[PDB]
Structures are given as C-alpha cells and as structure tokens.
Amino acid sequence: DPRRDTSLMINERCNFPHNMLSEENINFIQDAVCNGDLGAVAALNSGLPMAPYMLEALLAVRVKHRLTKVRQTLEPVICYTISVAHLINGTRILRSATAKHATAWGPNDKHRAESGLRRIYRALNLEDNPFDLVEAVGDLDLSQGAYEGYVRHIYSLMKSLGHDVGHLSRSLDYSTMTVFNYLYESPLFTSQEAVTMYSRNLAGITKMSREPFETLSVVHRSKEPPEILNDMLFLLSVGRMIVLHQESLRALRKNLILTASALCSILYTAYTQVPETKSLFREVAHEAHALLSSRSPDTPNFRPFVACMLQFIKQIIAADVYTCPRYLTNQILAVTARMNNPYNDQNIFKCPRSLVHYVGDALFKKTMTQELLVSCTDQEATYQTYELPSVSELVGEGVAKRA
Amino acid sequence: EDPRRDTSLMINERCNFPHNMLSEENINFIQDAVCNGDLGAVAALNSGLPMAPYMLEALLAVRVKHRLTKVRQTLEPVICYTISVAHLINGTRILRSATAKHATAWGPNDKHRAESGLRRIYRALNLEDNPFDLVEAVGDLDLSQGAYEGYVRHIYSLMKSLGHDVGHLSRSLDYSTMTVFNYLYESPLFTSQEAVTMYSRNLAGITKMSREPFETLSVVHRSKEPPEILNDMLFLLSVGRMIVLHQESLRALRKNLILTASALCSILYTAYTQVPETKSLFREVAHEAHALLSSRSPDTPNFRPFVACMLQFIKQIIAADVYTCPRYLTNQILAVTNNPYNDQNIFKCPRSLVHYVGDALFKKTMTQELLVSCTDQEATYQTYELPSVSELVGEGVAKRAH
C-alpha cells in the first residue's frame, strides 16, 4: 500500500495535478530543472501540508546550467508554478482530510467511545458528560483553547488510570507523524501501535488514500481506555491540523495573487529585452490583472496565468539573452540619472525583425520604478522612489545601434 | 606543473576570498553555510574571473545547507552580495596586473623584432604603411572599438596576401581554452593551434595571477616570420580589448553593488522587524548602505564594512529560529490592510520592550508597486506605502505576553 506507508510517491507528471498544465509544459519544467532537485519539486507539488512561509523557504529550485542566462526569470516562473500545483493539490487534500475526519466514526463508533468513556468517568467518580468529549472530537469549530483543554483532559484521565504518559511517550518516536504533514503536531500517544496506525492515517491524507482513518476502538472493536483515549487524541489533533491547513491555503492564495503582480513586473524587464514577445507578454499582464481584480466568490484559478508565463518564457529562452531584472533596472537607473545603455549590448537586447509594431509607441508600457536608501538616522531610513520612464528611448537607442 | 597558467582550478585556503576583506570567523561562517556542491562555484566566482556583471548575476546560484532553510531568503542574498564584493576586489587586482602585462609584453627589442618582420611583409607587398604604427597600436589601450577592428582586419588581409587562407586555418582550431578563465575575451581568428595554446596560458595567467609576462611566439622562438608576429599582434590587440571591456565591467559592477545595497537593506529590514532586538545591528547595516550611496569621496567605494555588518546581523537572525521570507511577510502585511507577527515561527519577541517594540522600532517605510489595470497596450502600476508594522508588531508582542 504505497498510499499509507512511509514511501515517497511520484506519478507520471512529477506530482503536478491533472488538468493544470499541458503535457508540453510539464515536460519543459522537468527538463529545465536540475536533476538533483526533481524530487523536491515532486514533494512540494504534492500539496504536503505546510505553512506558506515553509513553502517559500523550501523553494530552492535550480535550473540546469544551460539555462543560466534566464535563471533570474525562469526560476521565479517555475517556483510560482510549483506553488500553484501545491495549492491545487493541497486543496484536494484538505477537502479529503475534512471528510475523513468527519466520518472516521459513525453512530456506532461514537456510541462505543462514549460507552467506554462512561466506564472511565464512573470509575474515577467524575461528573463529566461523556457525550461532550466524543462530540468535540468530531468538531472542527474548536478554539486552540478548547483543543488543548480536551487534550489535557485526556492526559489526566490517562494518568488517573495508571498510565505513565511520560515514560510511555519518552520511549516512542513521533517523527513518523510529520513526514507528510508539516502542520501536524503530535500528542503524546502512548503506544507504538497507535503511532504507527495514526502515522498511516496522516500519510494517507497527503497521499490521497481512499481508505477511511483507522482508529483503535474501531479496529479492535474495543471500549477500553487505551484505544479510545488515543483515538480521541488523534481525532482532535487532526482537527487542529485541518484548521491550520485551511488557513495556510488561504494565505497561500493571497500570496500567489500578490506575487502575480510582482512576477509580471520582472517579466516586463525581459519583455523589453525581446520586444517581439509583446503579444505574449500582454497575455501575462492581463491574466495577472484578472487574478488581482477577480470578483468571483469562486476560488482564484491560476492555470491561465501559469500557461501564459511559460509560453512567454520559452520565447525569452529562444532569444539567447541574459535576463537579470535587478541588474537591468539598476543600469537603466544609473543611465537615467545623467557604454552604459544595457540595450546597446547584444547579450542583453534582441532586436526585433520588424520595428513598426514592436518598439516606440508600439512598445507595451509598464511604469518602472526603483526605490533607494537616500538618508539614514538612528531612528529612520528614508527611501526615495525613482521613476524610469526613459525605457522606451533607451530601447530605441539599442535598436538604432544595430543599423 | 605551473598551476597559474594551465587549465586547473586554483582554490586557496580562503575559498578564493581576497585577503583583508572578511574576518576569519566570517570566511568560516560562509564556507560552512553553503551547500558543499556549490563551494567550487563560490571559489570560482570569488576569484574575479573576468565577466560582465550580468554574467555574475546569472551565475550566482548559491544554495545554503538544509539546516539554514529558515533564513534562506535573507542569508542567500547576503552571501551572494559578499561573493560579488570578493569578485570586484579580486577582479580589480586582475585588471591592474593584466594592464601591466599588456603594456610590457614587448620590450624595445621585441618591438623592433616585430617592426622588422613587418617591414619585410610590407616590402614584399609593395605597401606604403609604416610598420611602426601597427606595432605601437598593439601596446595601446586607447583604441576605439573602431580602430581595433580595423587593425585586426589589416592583419587578416596581410595574412591572405601571404597566401594564408585565414578561414580554412581558423575554422578547425579549438578556441575553447581561451575563455575558460575569461568570459570577456573575444578571440580573433588565429592561424595555428600553437598560437591558441600559448595565448590560452596567457589568459589563464591573467585570472590566476601568474607573475610571468605574456608569452608571445615572436619572443619565445625569436622569430620575425609572419605567422609568429601576426598572430602575436592579434593576441595583444584582442587582450587589449578585453582589458577595456573588463574595466567597463568593474565600473558597472561597482555601481550595481552600491544600488543593490539599498535592496539588500530592504530585504534585511523585514527580518529585523521579526527579531526587533537586532535594532542596533540593523541600524549599522542601514548606515553603511547609506554611506555607500551618498559618499562624496573620490576614492573607490569600499564594501567591506557593509558586508561585515550584514554578516553580524544575519548571525543574530539565524539564532532567533524564525522563517525569514521577505516577500511572504510583505504580502501578508499588505493583505491585512491574519497578522504574521502573531506566528511564533515568524516573530521573536524581545525581552525589553521599551527599547525595541513601539516607537523604539527603527523605521523604514515599506513601499510596494501594484498592478491595478491593464490594456492591450499597457500594464498600469501604482505605488502604495504600507501601514507601519509598528501596530502589527506591537500586536504580536501582546499575544506573547498573555
């Protein structure tokens, strides 16, 4: 069973979701990425639940040396594309996990837990309603406060029954619980059986197993405290992971929408170097603006922006020029502050073959700015924003040069 | 075995950092932080291997080890800036040495040997030209790109007029080794592999700081014959062109580094806000970025203090055990307006609050261009200032007190 064991699954598409990319674009990305990095792409593509800042920190994907010239534009495009695959797949994970969590226990399984818990409260002379805890375990509308309360409640019952939670947990290795889920934080399960079974549930979440969650009270048909209390710790701790997963994916969606504006901006610099890509760059811009201004209550759909970015970057690759957005922007800035003109350099600028429809007022316009640290005190660093409207003239001048 | 002139990669005890740039603790911090598979590329880029600044930028693909994943998006730009400064310092030294080797490749007697062999060529061709002018020009750096291409073409036509089919000869030669140590050199068509071999050792010796003078065929074989002298002239001319381009590259690199210090300071500000007890170290980083951009002095910019400050700062960021993701953080701050400073993987609360958290927060206004509309002819961006993180950071401080 590859979907619940400790194995790393990778399908035919490098774990890209189906119906997000063309076969060609899937092949393009696989061929462009360093071979040593393909496993990390497949893992991040999988939707492995994680915070958005962990995704960003783990996204250290290199292109092959032969793509060095476009590395500063192609790597951001690919990293965005992976983040989109992560979001699409992770959304399927979240929905599937939510269903598994809500249906792990049917009426008869809730009754078995609640009966066993009645037995516990009685033996301990406790006034608590066993129905309450069994309902909470099924409840995703649960504060971080109540969660840790219920967990602490379960720990006491365990200790009161003579279970050395401490000793038992210090002898167990929980590392397996988070191999496929970076948002999950494991309670102190008190048996290796439990750890092993719940680790298979967590693996199955990420690897899209179709089986329901295994729980010990169901598997053994047992009302006994060891089975039902660990089971409740599992179900509560999955509910908390799910709440955090939902919030991570919302924050990832917002990041991708904002980053869409930033990527369009650095892809503009590359468009100015290869102005025959105008119609391709226009689509990159319209799809970025569509994401940022979308009104749909529907989720944002990043597939058209990604497709546009990749069809653009393939023509940039064909131009055989160095795309260095920061360098180019810094050179434009230096020149403007008045050979310096980067567009006079063949390694930078690829002159279009017909000029009427590509440069001059036919140049797609985006305002270029750069901010600079212009004063510093012991309390503030002042930045000044510089506008570089001069781009069209410099490009004009590099066209002229080639004549 | 002459390592300074063959095709071997020299790497000193400092990963090719120049001396008197970085403390020893900082050199060791960087060697230990970088993925081992990338140390070779760090040493090669540190060496100053002549290249255009855009080539340095495209090649700066340097990964930190996995144990530093949390700070990767701040530490890597810092390491990459530091390598680019090593590259400027060392390449500035290469340029000065290459300039001296080019200006002195031929002494008086060697100039006489070439002018004599050249007068023979001119006599046998019934040409009026002064052999002195061409020999003077191969030792002159004050040549337009125009006069250069013209002297090459003159040599090329002497070669055909002597029966030398320049095309047949040069097409089958291997010029690979000419550029292994110099990405600015643009080879002429040489006439023999013997020429290419010796000229490749000259170019190797430039980047690897051989103290030998250039080898030329006319000098080594004490020959006046046209192959020797005409191939030598092509070489001295073409290395003269590389030096001119190399000086232009270092000027452009110096200016990128000064402007980029302003971007690095903006990246590192996001991390200061996550770890506000770093205020006095961050303030130094910013003061040093400001000095670089605002210095009136004539003497060259000196990046060593900015680097040391960035490195001292990032060490404290590593210690705080938080994820530094400047674009994520800025997007989240832009989005509000969930608070990233409430997340303990993001924000490290200081112990003394009066000196760090509220109005004691060092201020840098965060500014962001945003795409707001587009047409078939444009993508409209407008610029927006972000609220102060003071209230957001403040909010994070409350949440960790109760």
Author numbering:
A (entry chain A): 8 to 345, 376 to 440
B (entry chain B): 7 to 343, 377 to 441
Text taken from the publication that reported this structure:
We previously identified the tegument protein M35 of murine cytomegalovirus (MCMV) as an essential antagonist of this antiviral system, showing that M35 interferes with type I IFN induction downstream of pattern-recognition receptor (PRR) activation. However, M27 alone does not suffice to efficiently shut off the type I IFN response in macrophages, and we identified the tegument protein M35 as the first MCMV antagonist of PRR-mediated Ifnb1 transcription and later on the MCMV m152 protein as a modulator of the adapter protein stimulator of interferon genes (STING) of the DNA-sensing PRR cyclic GMP-AMP synthase (cGAS). Both M35 and its HCMV homolog UL35 are packaged into the virus particles as part of the tegument and therefore enter the host cell directly during infection, and both inhibit type I IFN signaling downstream of cGAS, as well as of the RNA sensor retinoid acid-inducible gene I (RIG-I), but upstream of IFNAR signaling. Our results suggest that M35 forms homodimers that directly bind to specific DNA sequences to antagonize recruitment of IRF3 to the promoters of antiviral genes and thus impair the IRF3-driven immediate antiviral response. Based on homology with the 85-kDa phospho-protein U14 of human herpesvirus 7 (HHV7), MCMV M35 is grouped in the pp85 protein superfamily that is conserved within the Betaherpesvirinae, but not the Alpha- or Gammaherpesvirinae.
Since previous analyses of HHV6B U14, a homolog of M35, indicated that the C-terminal part of the proteins was disordered, we generated expression constructs for purification of full-length M35 (amino acids [aa] 2 to 519; M35_FL) and a short version of M35 (aa 2 to 452; M35_S) corresponding to the structured U14 N-terminal domain (aa 2 to 458). Similar to U14, two M35_S chains form an antiparallel homodimer with an extended interface along the long protein axis. Most of the residues of M35_S could be located in the electron density, with the exception of the most N-terminal residues 1 to 6, the most C-terminal residues 442 to 452, a fragment of 34 aa in M35 chain A from positions 344 to 376, and 31 aa in chain B from positions 346 to 375, respectively. The individual M35 moieties are comprised of 14 α-helixes creating an elongated main body with two protuberant β-sheets forming a hairpin (middle). The β-hairpin of one monomer reaches out to the β-hairpin of the second M35 protomer of the M35 dimer (top), constituting a prominent part of the dimer interface. At the opposite site from the β-hairpins, a groove bends along the interface (bottom). Due to its bend and asymmetric elevations of the walls at the interface creating deep and shallow stretches, we approximated the size of the groove with a width of about 20 Å from wall to wall and roughly 83 Å from one end to the other. These dimensions could accommodate a B-DNA double helix at a length of approximately 21 bp, indicating this as a candidate site for DNA binding.
